[PDB]
Design a protein around this ligand. Structure first.
Ligand SMILES: [Cs+]
Ligand SMILES: [Cs+]
Ligand SMILES: [Cs+]
Ligand SMILES: [Pt+2]
Length: 106
């Protein structure tokens, strides 16, 4: 399905911070809260892919792009950050702030 891929691509390309998430997902909530703590709201988009008829196609494409089908799936300026554990590692080790600095976001 080209439509699904194009839809996912538009979300990633039109938002510097793009998070694919689902309902009642604690690690989604944690990752989003961490990102909002950098005052990134204006350049963030969160897409709930569970409330979507094509969830499985979206997840399969996210796995093709990132290696995992699970949510949260986090992209920053089209680069794959990964899941919430990946975000926590980057945040604790300073890489997240460097990412955001290079983008003029921090
Ligand atoms: Cs912060
Ligand atoms: Cs937003
Ligand atoms: Cs930090
Ligand atoms: Pt949005």
């Amino acid at each position: 399905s080209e439509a699904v891929k194009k839809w996912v691509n538009k979300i990633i390309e039109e938002n510097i911070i793009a998070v694919f998430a689902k309902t009642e997902c604690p690690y989604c909530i944690k990752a989003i809260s961490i990102l909002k703590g950098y005052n990134l709201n204006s350049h963030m988009h969160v897409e709930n892919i569970e409330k979507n008829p094509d969830m499985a196609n979206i997840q399969a494409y996210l796995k093709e792009l990132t290696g995992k089908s699970s949510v949260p799936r986090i992209f920053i300026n089209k680069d794959v950050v990964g899941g919430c554990d990946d975000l926590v590692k980057e945040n604790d080790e300073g890489k997240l702030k460097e990412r955001l600095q290079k983008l003029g976001l921090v």
